Amino acid sequence: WVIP
Amino acid sequence: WVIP
Amino acid sequence: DSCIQFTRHASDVLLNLNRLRSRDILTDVVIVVSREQFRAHKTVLMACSGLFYSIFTDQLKCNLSVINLDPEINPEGFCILLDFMYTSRLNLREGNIMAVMATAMYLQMEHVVDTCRKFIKAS
Amino acid sequence: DSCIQFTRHASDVLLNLNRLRSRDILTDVVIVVSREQFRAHKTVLMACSGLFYSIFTDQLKCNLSVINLDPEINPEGFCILLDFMYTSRLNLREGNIMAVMATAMYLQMEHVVDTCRKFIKAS
Ligand SMILES: CN(C)c1ncc(Cl)c(Nc2ccc3c(c2)CC(=O)N3)n1
Ligand SMILES: CN(C)c1ncc(Cl)c(Nc2ccc3c(c2)CC(=O)N3)n1
Ligand SMILES: [Cl-]
Ligand SMILES: [Cl-]
């Protein structure tokens, strides 16, 4: 999971 | 396009 | 093999499937969650959820145009997860994380359950 | 928004759609190319091709279970492109590049046409  |  | 690969292809496919959903094009099922109705593509639901995968591979349920979820399922939690299925983006917030995790456990969306468990453990 | 994103989600969705295709699950159309028949999901074809997008948004053609392609279309070129649609992988070879480019131009798959033009220019 990432900060888009 | 890339070499997978 | 000696194939070449187009990096953005999967993301572009998902973006177009979401455009079809937003315009209600070729949607073939309505998911009923309490009073709320959500139109979707059976194939996308199966690709994202262990529960829908099991439902639509069933020789009788594969032909249903309406699927009713367990009454304990929260419509907002389902809406956030349906949006995630079609975008890869999860709107996870303090006020919805418990409903999102419970819905993801029911839908059998293992990666969502994992990030909810980690975000809850941090707080 | 304040969303989080799962990097591998789009690729995982496409992988599962290809698993459904390989098992012939929820396929809703057969594409006829000369003597050859290819089963697929209308939504995936639309998401990948400007030609299929136009065909299946048409109020009459959206209901057809069989689509016949132009007799000039090569079945192998179509097969390579159908595999690309479901995997992001293009089996581009010296012996098939002309048939692949011609099929991609007909199917309106702009990124495939672009890589074929570049590979032809290099040789
Ligand atoms: C497991 N399998 C062969 C498969 N093939 C095709 C599809 Cl659409 C599919 N989808 C599916 C099954 C289980 C799970 C998911 C999708 C997401 C998840 O967390 N569990 N799973
Ligand atoms: C253009 N548009 C709004 C849109 N929405 C949904 C879908 Cl499924 C779609 N697909 C499509 C249209 C044109 C092209 C492609 C897909 C690939 C391409 O090279 N051209 N295009
Ligand atoms: Cl997931
Ligand atoms: Cl393309």
> What is the dotted CATH code of the domain comprising C1-123?
3.30.710.10
Å from CA of C26 to ligand 3 middle: 23
Query: Quick check: D120 and D78 in contact, CB under 8 A?
Result: no
Experimental technique behind these coordinates: X-ray
Contact D92/D119 with Cβ under 8 angstroms?
yes
For C59, residues 6+ apart whose C-beta sits below 8 A from its C-beta are none
**CB under 6 Å to ligand 2: residues?**
C 16, 19-20; D 46-50, 53, 108-110
Cα C66 to averaged position of ligand 1 atoms, centre (Å): 21
Interface test with A, best of D4, D9, D12 (most A CBs within 10 A): D4
Nearest to C44 by CA among C104, C92, C84, C99: C84
Q: Which residues pair with C41 in a beta bridge?
A: none
For D92, other C-beta atoms within 10 Å of its C-beta total 19
What is the secondary structure of C29-94 as a DSSP string? EEEEETTEEEEE-HHHHHHH-HHHHHHHTSTTGGG-SEEEPPTTS-HHHHHHHHHHHHHSEE---T
- Structure token digits, residue C25: 């094009």
> Can you tell me the distance from the alpha carbon of C68 to that of C62, in angstroms, rounded to the nearest whole number?
14
| CA distances, C66 to each of C51, C53, C111, C121 (Å) | 15, 15, 26, 36
Handedness of CA D14, D19, D21, D24 (dihedral sign): negative
Distance between Cα D86 and ligand 4 center (Å): 11
Please state the domain extents for chain C: 1-123
Q: Do B3 and C6 touch (CB under 8 A)?
A: no
- How many residues does the structure list for chain B? 4
Q: Give the span between the Cα atoms of C105 and D1, in whole angstroms.
A: 24
Question: Which residue of D46, D48, D55, D88 sits with most ligand 2 atoms within 8 Å of its CB, as the best mutation to test the pocket?
Answer: D46
Residue C96, token pair as written in the block: 């919805």
Instruction: Choose among C66, C112, C108: nearest CA to D3.
Output: C112
Compute, in degrees rounded to 10, the torsion defined by CA atoms D8, C92, C13, C20: 160
